[PDB]
Amino acid sequence: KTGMLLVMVSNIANPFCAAVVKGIEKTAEKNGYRILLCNTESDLARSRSCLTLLSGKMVDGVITMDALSELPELQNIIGAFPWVQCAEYDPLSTVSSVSIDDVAASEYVVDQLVKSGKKRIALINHDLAYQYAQHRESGYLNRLKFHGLDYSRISYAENLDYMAGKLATFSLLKSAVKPDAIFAISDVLAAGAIQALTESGLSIPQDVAVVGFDGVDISQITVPALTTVQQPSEQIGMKAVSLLLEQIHSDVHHLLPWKFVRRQSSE
Amino acid sequence: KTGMLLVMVSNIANPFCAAVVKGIEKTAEKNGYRILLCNTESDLARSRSCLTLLSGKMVDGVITMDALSELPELQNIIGAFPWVQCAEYDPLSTVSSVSIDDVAASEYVVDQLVKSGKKRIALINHDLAYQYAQHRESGYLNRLKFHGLDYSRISYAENLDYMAGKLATFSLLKSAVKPDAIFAISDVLAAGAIQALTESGLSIPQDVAVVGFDGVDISQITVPALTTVQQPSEQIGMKAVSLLLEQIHSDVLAKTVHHLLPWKFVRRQSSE
Ligand SMILES: [Cl-]
C-alpha cells in the first residue's frame, strides 16, 4: 500500500553493498516500489530509528544486510512484517533469506591454494559479528586441518578499507614465519595486501599469493589482477526483493552460486 | 525524541557520496539525529517520492547532492523546511550550499598539465545534468583556449565505473591525434583510464599523463598513484548538517549562505 521499501545496508562504502543495493533498486522499481536506505552498520541504535517506518506505516517491507549478531533483536522489532535477510542471515531462523554458501567458498579457495603448492596461508578477516566472517573463518580452518597444514594465522582488519588490509599484511610479515599466501575476506582488504606485498618487494604470487572475496571492480584494478570469489551480488539483491514481494502479497534460505575467478594474483 | 534527516544521494556507488555521507552521519548523530538515505540520482520521480517523508513528518530536513536544476522542481514540496545543497554551487540560489569551486580547480588542473609541457589534454566527463560536471567542462575548454592550445577533446562516460573510464579512454586513443594527457571528472573514471593506457602500452606520465577528481581511496590504489583534485569530502557533509541545524534551530533565523571549502591539487606519479 505505500509503494516504499526499507533497505538496511551494513556499509554503503562497501562496494559489495552498493552492487547488492543496485540489484534491489532494480527489482523494486520493476515492481512499482521505491527504496529508502539506512546505513546501519549493524548498529541497532540506527536500526531502531529507521524501523519506526514500519509502525509509522511508511513502508510495505524490509530487507536487511545487518550482522547475524543483531538479527535476534531485529526479529523482536520486525515480527511477521515482510522481511528478507540478504547476504547476512540466520540459518536457524524462520526468516526468508538469500546469500551464497560462504563456508563452501572459502574451503574451495584454500583447496586451490594448497593444490598450487602453497602451505602457509593466512586469512585477513574482519568483524566476527557477521556470520559471513564466521563462515569464511570456519571454511579456512576446515581445510587447514584437512590438508594437515600447521601454519594458521588470522589477522582481524578493523575497517573495511585498503589501509586495513595493508597494515594487516605488514603485521603478518613481521613474524619469523611469513605466509606464502593471503586470503582476504574482501577484495578491498586484498588490494591493501597487494600493496603492502609490493612495497615490501615480494612477488605475487611467487613469494605470496593473494585471493580476495566478492568480485567487485577493485579486483580488476589491482596489479596483479586479483583472484577472488565472485558473488552474483546484483542477483542477490534482485532475488531478495522477489522473495519480499511474495510476503507482501500473501501471508526458505536460498543459496545462489558463487564462482572462483582465477587471476594473476594466484596463478 | 531522536529525529531523522533525509539525504538525497546522487549515486550511492560513487565513493565521493559515501565520504560525504560519512561526515553527514558524524555531525547528525552528535545532535540527536539519525540518517535516512535515498539514492535519487537526480531522478525526479524518486525525489518526489522520498520527499513524502517530509510531509509525513518522518524527517526534519533534507540534504541533497542532486543536480542543481532539480531545486526549482522541488521548491514547492520543500517550502521553508530545512534544506541544504551539497556539491553544487550557485550563489544566486536561495538554498544554502556547501561545495568546492569546480571552475577554479579544473582550470588549475589544466594550468599544471600545461606547465609540465602537455599540449593535448583530453577530458573524460560523465553526466552533464550536474552543474559541477558543466563547470569542469567549461573550465577545461576555456583554459585550453586561454593557453592557445589547438587540441580539444571530450569523451563522456555513461556510467560512473572503471570500465566506463577505460571505454572513454579507448575512444580518445582512436583518433588522428592522440592525447598526451587525460583529465577525468572522477578518480573512478581515471583508474579506468590508467588501465586502458597500460593495456595499450602507453607510459604514464611520459606518453600520457592522467589526473582525476575527488581524492577517494582508489586514487591511492592505482599504479601509478593518481594525481587528483582532493575535496574535503567529510567536511562537506559535516558542514551541510551544520547548515541544516541552523535552519532547524529555533533561536536563529538562518539566512542563505554558500560555503566554499578549499580543494587541494595532490600531485602523484600519474602526472608528475
Ligand atoms: Cl574509492
Side-chain angles (χ1 to χ4, degrees), chain A residues 203-235:
Chain A
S203 293
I204 297 155
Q206 305 106 282
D207 301 313
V208 188
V210 183
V211 175
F213 209 103
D214 282 344
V216 292
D217 298 352
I218 201 166
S219 79
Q220 305 205 255
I221 278 151
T222 243
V223 192
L226 184 77
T227 294
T228 181
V229 171
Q230 183 176 284
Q231 305 198 53
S233 296
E234 165 155 296
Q235 203 82 20

Side-chain angles (χ1 to χ4, degrees), chain A residues 3-4 6 9 12-13 18-19 21-22 25-26 29 34-41 43 45-46 49-53 56-58 161-163 188 191-192 195 217-218 220-223, chain B residues 2-4 6 12-13 17-18 21-22 25 29 34-41 43 45-46 49-54 56-58 159 161-163 191-192 195 217-218 220-223:
Chain A
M4 283 275 210
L6 174 61
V9 177
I12 61 180
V21 169
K22 156 114 94 142
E25 279 177 342
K26 278 191 162 190
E29 291 190 329
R34 298 294 178 187
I35 282 299
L36 299 164
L37 310 168
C38 188
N39 191 39
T40 63
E41 305 180 88
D43 172 358
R46 303 175 167 174
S49 190
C50 65
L51 291 162
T52 52
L53 295 163
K57 314 191 143 195
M58 297 284 272
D161 72 1
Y162 89 97
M163 274 308 293
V188 171
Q195 188 178 107
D217 298 352
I218 201 166
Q220 305 205 255
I221 278 151
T222 243
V223 192
Chain B
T2 135
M4 289 190 285
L6 175 62
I12 217 190
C17 297
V21 175
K22 192 179 172 39
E25 292 168 330
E29 302 197 308
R34 312 290 184 169
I35 297 298
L36 280 177
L37 305 175
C38 182
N39 187 46
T40 44
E41 308 189 85
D43 179 329
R46 278 190 195 159
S49 148
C50 68
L51 288 170
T52 60
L53 299 164
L54 252 195
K57 309 140 111 79
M58 297 289 318
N159 298 303
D161 60 27
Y162 90 93
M163 183 56 39
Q195 189 164 119
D217 287 5
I218 198 60
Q220 300 171 315
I221 289 155
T222 51
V223 174

Side-chain angles (χ1 to χ4, degrees), chain A residues 1 17 59 80 91 121 168 173 186 193 232 241 244 264:
Chain A
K1 52 243 162 60
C17 284
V59 300
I121 302 148
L173 292 173
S186 135
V241 175
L244 191 62
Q264 287 205 197

Side-chain angles (χ1 to χ4, degrees), chain B residues 121-128 133 137 140-141 151-159 163-174 179 181-186 189 193:
Chain B
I121 299 156
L123 180 79
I124 298 178
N125 204 343
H126 166 51
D127 178 5
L128 282 181
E137 182 170 308
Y140 157 82
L141 282 175
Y151 178 103
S152 221
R153 99 174 115 272
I154 302 164
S155 170
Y156 294 92
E158 167 153 57
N159 298 303
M163 183 56 39
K166 194 167 168 175
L167 299 175
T169 302
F170 285 123
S171 179
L172 298 162
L173 294 176
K174 258 190 164 183
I182 291 173
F183 175 28
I185 259 38
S186 165
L189 294 176

Side-chain angles (χ1 to χ4, degrees), chain B residues 126-139:
Chain B
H126 166 51
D127 178 5
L128 282 181
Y130 297 82
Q131 192 187 243
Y132 54 81
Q134 291 170 39
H135 279 349
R136 288 167 201 170
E137 182 170 308
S138 307

